Amino acid sequence: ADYKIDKEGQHAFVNFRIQHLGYSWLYGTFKDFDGTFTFDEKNPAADKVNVTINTTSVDTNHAERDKHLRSADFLNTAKYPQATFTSTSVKKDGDELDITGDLTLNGVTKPVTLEAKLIGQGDDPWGGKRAGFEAEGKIKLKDFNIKTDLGPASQEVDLIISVEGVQQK
Amino acid sequence: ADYKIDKEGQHAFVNFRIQHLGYSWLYGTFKDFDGTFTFDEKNPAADKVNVTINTTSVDTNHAERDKHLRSADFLNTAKYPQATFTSTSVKKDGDELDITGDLTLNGVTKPVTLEAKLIGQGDDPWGGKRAGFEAEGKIKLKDFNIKTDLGPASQEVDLIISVEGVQQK
Ligand SMILES: CC(C)=CCC/C(C)=C/CC/C(C)=C/CC/C(C)=C/CC/C(C)=C/CC/C(C)=C/CC/C(C)=C/CC/C(C)=C/Cc1ccccc1O
Numbered sequence: 211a212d213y214k215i216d217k218e219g220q221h222a223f224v225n226f227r228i229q230h231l232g233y234s235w236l237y238g239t240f241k242d243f244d245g246t247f248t249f250d251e252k253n254p255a256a257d258k259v260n261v262t263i264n265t266t267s268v269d270t271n272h273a274e275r276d277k278h279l280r281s282a283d284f285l286n287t288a289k290y291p292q293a294t295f296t297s298t299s300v301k302k303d304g305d306e307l308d309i310t311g312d313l314t315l316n317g318v319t320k321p322v323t324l325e326a327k328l329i330g331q332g333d334d335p336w337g338g339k340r341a342g343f344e345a346e347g348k349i350k351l352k353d354f355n356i357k358t359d360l361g362p363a364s365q366e367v368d369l370i371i372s373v374e375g376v377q378q379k
Numbered sequence: 380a381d382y383k384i385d386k387e388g389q390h391a392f393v394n395f396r397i398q399h400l401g402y403s404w405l406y407g408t409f410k411d412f413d414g415t416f417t418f419d420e421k422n423p424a425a426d427k428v429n430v431t432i433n434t435t436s437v438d439t440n441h442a443e444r445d446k447h448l449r450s451a452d453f454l455n456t457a458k459y460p461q462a463t464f465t466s467t468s469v470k471k472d473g474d475e476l477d478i479t480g481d482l483t484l485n486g487v488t489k490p491v492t493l494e495a496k497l498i499g500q501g502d503d504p505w506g507g508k509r510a511g512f513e514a515e516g517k518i519k520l521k522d523f524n525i526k527t528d529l530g531p532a533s534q535e536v537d538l539i540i541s542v543e544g545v546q547q548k
């Protein structure tokens with residue numbers, strides 16, 4: 211079935227974390243994004259996913275740091291107001307889904323794989339059908355032209371994802 | 380040594396997640412908190428921790444839902460503008476710390492245990508000493524008089540914590 215990510219009720223989250231000086235985890239989120247996805251429990255190879263993110267909506271709960279994350283030193287949102295992820299391959303791996311796709315971030319497109327898992331699906335208390343998932347992945351900062359070094363412990367960023375979809379059609 | 384949680388550079392996060400209809404994970408965060416902590420790597424029994432959280436600063440990236448979280452139906456911030464955590468016992472459990480303490484949430488004080496771990500410690504690029512930790516815990520909603528039911532899969536909330544301290548004295 212085809213699904214629409216629940217942006218209206220915001221039961222979708224694109225979070226992330228990366229170490230700070232190798233001393234602690236720095237958490238953040240991208241508050242403005244949307245997307246769709248096809249989920250067929252019997253035929254996993256037919257699954258799809260297409261999401262758009264407005265990178266300017268990054269939030270790590272610090273005005274100054276975020277102003278810096280939007281700068282040309284990092285996300286460079288003025289030049290690339292958007293990050294985008296489109297699947298190219300999906301394959302069932304036991305009780306999980308390995309989602310391979312093209313990530314266009316900071317001007318560069320490179321394939322990244324996410325490990326997703328069905329949390330639950332079923333009826334809506336309002337007459338709709340839903341399906342939610344949790345996912346993980348990593349992004350090597352250098353691969354997407356983000357040169358500003360953050361230390362040996364901070365070369366890649368952990369992606370903590372969770373989306374609830376509303377069945378379409 | 381005594382530490383002051385880095386609220387200035389906000390290298391501290393009090394996050395949480397709970398399921399939505401057993402379909403997906405709903406993430407949130409408390410943007411306004413402060414605190415201190417004593418860390419002695421050799422004598423873990425002397426460790427302390429005291430944090431204050433302005434519950435009104437809750438954020439799940441949805442204005443409506445958050446207005447509801449502040450309401451009498453949940454956090455009841457108008458009556459109780461603050462949550463508070465004071466350790467009462469700390470003991471080394473192998474390579475981690477089990478921090479027991481009193482949590483005053485929504486008017487009720489009950490002991491909750493956190494499982495923390497040292498991420499790293501060392502010198503500052505600015506001449507200070509730091510030590511960061513990651514921690515986990517669970518809060519049973521009913522225990523703290525948060526009656527409004529969210530379903531069988533949503534009885535307790537996952538606490539995802541990370542704090543970096545700046546050595547005092
Ligand atoms: C097919 C099917 C059935 C589907 C199931 C449903 C699913 C699971 C579909 C997937 C859904 C979604 C939304 C998938 C999204 C996938 C992807 C790959 C999204 C891309 C997200 C994205 C925009 C990546 C950006 C991540 C990055 C690079 C974050 C920046 C982190 C960063 C630099 C932090 C800086 C850290 C640091 C120590 C800064 C120091 C610092 C600087 C200045 C002042 C103070 C200070 O402390």
Ligand SMILES: CC(C)=CCC/C(C)=C/CC/C(C)=C/CC/C(C)=C/CC/C(C)=C/CC/C(C)=C/CC/C(C)=C/CC/C(C)=C/Cc1ccccc1O
Nearest residue numbers: 399416417418426427428430444462464495512514529536
């Ligand atoms: C000792 C030493 C060396 C220290 C190491 C360093 C450490 C690790 C020190 C600890 C540092 C800190 C900060 C420790 C903090 C500890 C604690 C226990 C903090 C308490 C935090 C707190 C305020 C708890 C609140 C959690 C709660 C109850 C969240 C509420 C969310 C809730 C009910 C969820 C809504 C879910 C739901 C399905 C909503 C319904 C709904 C309504 C409307 C629209 C949409 C919708 O979905």
